[model samples]
Target chain A: KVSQALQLTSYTEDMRAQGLEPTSQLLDIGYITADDRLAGLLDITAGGRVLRIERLRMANGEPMAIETTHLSAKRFPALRRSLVKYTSLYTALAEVYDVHLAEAEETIETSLATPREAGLLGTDVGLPMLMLSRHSQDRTGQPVEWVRSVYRGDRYKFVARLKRP
Target chain B: MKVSQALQLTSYTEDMRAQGLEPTSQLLDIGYITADDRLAGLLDITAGGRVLRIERLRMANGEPMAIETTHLSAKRFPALRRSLVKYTSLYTALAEVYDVHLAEAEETIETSLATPREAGLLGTDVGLPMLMLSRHSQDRTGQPVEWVRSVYRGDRYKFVARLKRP
Candidate 1:
């Protein structure tokens, strides 16, 4: 039962399938300026750089999830400019950058929202929330992207299946 | 891969014990009840169908890793009531007791906060972040047997699963 994986191609497709008018807002994008934990996870040297992107996904003008993605700057050139122009990053990755996302490993955790996070995600600071983390690689076996996101629990329910090996 | 009663956790726990980690399980509750809408929907049992709840704390080296609360449709296996106590070996007991061979399972993962009760069980702050794993089990014939929600310590556990392209 577990062999099939119906992956959400991008925020746009995933949202639209769930019956929502989808949009992506690139909240913040920059180089890893103040780097500590992130540097180690992405294996970025102090002299090296990575594209640190934070985007807010909305459904019908309501905030759904905020995703913070880190792409190896070397792997994706002019990422900032491209993101500004392209609404669908998944499409951009493949069409513009020629990077195909072949596999993704994801983990999920739960916590309370912070005040600033609460305001952005339509939840109070102390309410229960969901955090999803993803590390993905390209078809050529290159680790291209790392992402962490927080979704308003009440507004989302993820569906997945499991099967035997 | 699918989650199952023949969990990779059992082997994980065994390895911890081999290193003298003193892993243990604390049974919190075991009882019978009729279906709630949620349970009925998940188990496909009618409103009047009876179900059993199995709650336990899985601790490693005296510290908790997760709490697994399993709900079994009593109509599927009537023997579960008598055989499932704090004493049975969850591994061998299923096949030995109820003729339910451990097989395929489906699990969904997410993030969540600990309730006051969840906090007490896992010894974490009320608002501390935790990983939530919900799993539903099935036998060889595809009959749904048990559904469980497992809450793990966010700071401690890391689950590894390998995937490939179609």
Candidate 2:
């Protein structure tokens, strides 16, 4: 049986027990400014301190996704290279920094791979891809990160729950 | 303006209204084939035979929009047509036809330019085009239709919706 890889885990022990090796490549990271719309969503000042970024493949072997995430620097003070390199951002925030992760809202859309995206993901140009955008928050409803991810559509399917009252 | 021009402008009801043109795109009637799962699910018809599909198009200055749409049939309406469509809102048509008007729906947004075929219909530069798509159907009775997808031009159109806490 092809073992399922756990991409996002709320617990570190579960990931280790599944024997799924965890690794991440930090492509580019620097302090940057936020767009007005993004700042409003993050509840920060317009053009506030944010982490401009591009992260390399966060997978076991084959590339899973290419992510560009923005973090509010004011909320996450003391964030350093060592913390990111050693652990998942979620882990570092909850375990080391004692931040609470409350809930996340996400949306998925279909798109065609651009030339640059195809090159980075090791796929053919014009291939279908899934664009996923997620906004995560803490217990107090403060936003933590605004993430935009391009996932190989053929390799991933998102499942959600719907309820009617 | 000519009828064709009226139809096209009518497509963007809000836009036309903003520019002082009366909006007029009506739903005359709808019919549906019960065997189609997606259609069947939308109208809430179980044993088939009693559904209707609706045809709708926008008209501005009497011109047609990018395209017209057809909604599958259900227990709500007795019959539908092209002439009756030039009369009122789709919600009103539903009430007149089947006694149902939609309450709410979910929408997905994306971008795409108009094709050569759509340019003449929309009365805009083929290259500088408008976006298009559909709104899926659902009634207060729990009937759900396959969601509609539309493409609107980035240059001439914009979409705005209010998101409330769920």
Candidate 3:
């Protein structure tokens, strides 16, 4: 995924760069009232609304990862309605709206799959899964989205570099 | 010392050396096991299957950071129990007794829940999220040396990897 993982990300951009056909299956998308747990995680008010976007990311017609993102509805009005275009969210934020993304921070961890997750990932239960959490804000440092992604461990491995500085 | 810390020595042992805190392990248990059903094939061990399990609560800076469970070839690293002592490095002992020095490693890190046993030792509640780092230590030529799995308190530790934007 190149630096898109570091900041502005596009499955379309990545697939094109890799010379592979990339596609996404929209699992579910809707506006939902935030609960306490959701509010706490995203640093938003409990009563406020959000656009919940869920998708299964794939490459060459094969599943890669599952994504769930929550965006502030109060900030982007009628964002749920706009999701029908079903293109890249970052692409829409930059093109349709004038929201230029500035930066992002992400954390990675590991866990086992529950039954529901196994079914969605087409893997067996208890299989190890890589979990990635991303908190991204806009150009003004205003928080915009919190996304949680899970990938099959057997199919993926992450690499990192250690520097002297 | 219900102990552990010294990073970027990135060496877990010598940090205690720098602290004048001579490193050591309080052996929780050390014995032979047939094999774990889940781990048997994962470890690449053949069916003779006797594994030496070394359980230790590693301490440093007078606190515990990891609950380490290491598995090894029981046939190869024999007669290590008598030499086991507090504040010693596992690498040092392996080199001294078995002529082994682990030079290459591969690892995976993930989130986990504190089991009842982990909660008691880690000072966290059951269900509290944890950071589990599982590793495969190998010799210079890439022959597998051992398998180690360490559970750490997620509230306390995080790992970062530098990435380049292409």
Best by DockQ: 1
Off by over 4 Å in 2: A1-26, A33-48, A56-65, A78-114, A122-143, A148-165, B1-38, B46-51, B55-68, B82-86, B103-116, B119-136, B145-149, B154-166
Better of 2 and 3 by DockQ: 3
Expressed as tens digits, the lDDT of each residue in A19-113 for candidate 2 is 65555567788788878988987889998999766765534566756778788887777666645754577767777667766666664454567
* Predicted candidate 1 versus true structure: per-residue lDDT over B1-166, tens digit per residue: 2111222323234545555666678888888888879888878899868998878888876787788888888877677767756334554466677666646767666666778998988888876767677777777777777788888777665443443445
TM-score, per-candidate, Cα-based:
0.81, 0.56, 0.55
On lDDT, the stronger of 1 and 3 is 1
Please state the error at residue B123 of candidate 2 in Å.
6.5
lDDT of 1 at B134: 77
Tens-digit lDDT string for candidate 1 (A1-165): 011123535677666666668887878888764266555555666556888898888888988788899877876888888777777887788778898878877655565678978887767887666666777788887777788888886666454555544
| Candidate 3 global CA lDDT score | 0.66
Looking at model 3 chain A, report the run of 10 residues with the lowest lDDT sum: A156-165
List DockQ for all candidates: 0.31, 0.07, 0.10
Candidate-wise lDDT, in order: 0.70, 0.54, 0.66
Best by TM-score: 1
In model 3, the runs with Cα more than 4 Å from the true position are: A1-8, A11-20, A40-43, B1-166
In the range A1-165, model 3's lDDT, one tens digit per residue, is 212223245557766766568788889987889898778656689977888889888877877779899987777776655655747787778766777666666666656677977888788787656777776767776777888888776665443322112
Error of 1 at A14 (Å): 2.0
